């Protein structure tokens, strides 16, 4: 029926308008997020250089964050968006974190889970999996002070000896169209480097009291770096997904419109034929 095609056209046009609106606001968010992530690179490099050269340059091997420890209880940090419509961005990280724990121990008393984003929690709640720490409705332009609490608490749970190892599951902005899930461990410290140079520091404070402040600052900065990359990949994923959705909506509108035109044009020539036959019949 022509009415079914016409009502389907109005609905698809509304979806096209909806997808284009979300694509442009996400494009605007990406332009800033890409620059923001790049702007913190010199801070992320400077903090990694001072914590590494202070810890590796005869900074001791028995310190709780640097020393080797047997593993029984493991912590997991998952990063997800507070809203959807970003394609496989959330499903990829949620599936890989679930399958990686399932491949060793699925029991909720062995591991510890931490989630950032409403979609991530909603998934674990429906999956019947508990969480220790949670954070939602974060701004699209995150500042260190917005996550300073969960960052200080997550590193604190390891410093207090409640976790033997801590892992992070999040997407990375490899390119403007392709992004992939990444797995890395926050603590203990394993990414060693050579004693090539040494920076200036005070002689009075003990090495342990220094590491107990500067190394957590590095971990907290790394959490912010992962979040900046997550925001860039989220905004890029929502933009590229809504671009494909807008393109799909347009081919559907084109094809439906040709069927609406053919159905209407086919009906009009028949009415003209009835006028001819009717007038000739008198």
């Amino acid at each position: 029926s022509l009415r079914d095609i016409k009502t389907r056209i109005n609905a698809t046009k509304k979806t096209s308008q909806i997808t284009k609106a979300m694509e442009m606001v996400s494009t605007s968010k990406l332009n800033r997020a890409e620059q923001n992530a790049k702007s913190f690179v010199p801070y992320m490099e400077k903090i990694q250089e001072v914590v590494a050269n202070v810890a590796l340059g005869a900074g001791g091997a028995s310190h709780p964050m640097l020393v080797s420890r047997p593993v029984k209880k493991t912590g997991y940090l998952v990063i997800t968006s507070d809203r959807g419509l970003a394609g496989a961005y959330n499903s990829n990280v949620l599936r890989l974190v679930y399958q990686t724990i399932q491949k060793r121990h699925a029991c909720p008393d062995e591991y510890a889970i931490i989630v950032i984003g409403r979609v991530g929690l909603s998934f674990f709640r429906k999956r019947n999996m508990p969480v220790i720490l949670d954070i939602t409705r974060l701004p699209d332009q995150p500042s260190f002070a917005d996550i300073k609490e969960i960052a200080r608490k997550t590193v604190g749970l390891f410093a207090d000896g409640t976790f033997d190892e801590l892992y992070m599951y999040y997407n990375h902005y490899v390119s403007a169209i392709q992004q992939e899930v990444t797995e890395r461990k926050l603590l203990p410290l394993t990414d060693l480097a050579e004693n090539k140079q040494r920076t200036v520091y005070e002689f009075e404070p003990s090495q342990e009291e220094c590491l107990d402040v500067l190394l957590p600052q590095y971990a907290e900065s790394l959490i912010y770096g992962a979040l900046l990359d997550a925001k860039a990949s989220e905004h890029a994923a929502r933009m590229t997904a809504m671009k494909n959705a807008t393109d799909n909506a347009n081919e559907l509108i084109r094809t439906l419109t040709l069927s609406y035109n053919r159905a209407r044009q086919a009906a009009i020539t028949q009415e003209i034929t009835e006028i001819v036959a009717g007038a000739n019949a008198l």
């Binding site: 509304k14 979806t15 809203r83 959807g84 419509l85 979609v119």
Partner: protein, 124 residues
């Protein structure tokens, strides 16, 4: 009937405006959800089996409950069950509400209807 018809009309009009983009709901603002939830429930009250005319005082008593939010807290699937149970409760005990609406035809006596309703929602 007019008084309660009015609130129903605004609630449905707003729901029709929102449903065009109701496709996504986990992303919609919690405020938009209030509009969606109310609209879904008012739709349910309108559902009726064939050969089942409801008397005007009862239609008033149920639309009043949905429009003032008293059916809003009930789950969407449970609303149809709650409707019959509430109407049997109002007729079986304290039938004075149904008697007054038939005579005056103008309400203005809602304090008792509210308090008498809270006694039903307390456990059923």
């Amino acid at each position: 009937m007019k008084q309660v018809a009015g609130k129903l009309r605004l609630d449905l009009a707003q729901y029709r405006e929102l449903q065009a983009f109701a496709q996504f709901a986990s992303d919609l603002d919690e405020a938009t959800r209030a509009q969606l939830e109310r609209g879904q429930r008012m739709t349910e009250i309108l559902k009726q089996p064939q050969y089942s005319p409801m008397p005007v005082e009862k239609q008033v008593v149920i639309i009043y409950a949905g429009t003032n939010g008293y059916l809003d807290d009930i789950p969407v699937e449970k609303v149809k069950e709650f409707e019959d149970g509430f109407l049997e409760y109002i007729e079986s005990k304290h039938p004075d509400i149904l008697e007054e609406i038939r005579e005056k035809k103008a309400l203005d006596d809602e304090l008792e209807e509210k308090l008498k309703k809270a006694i039903k929602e307390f456990k059923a």
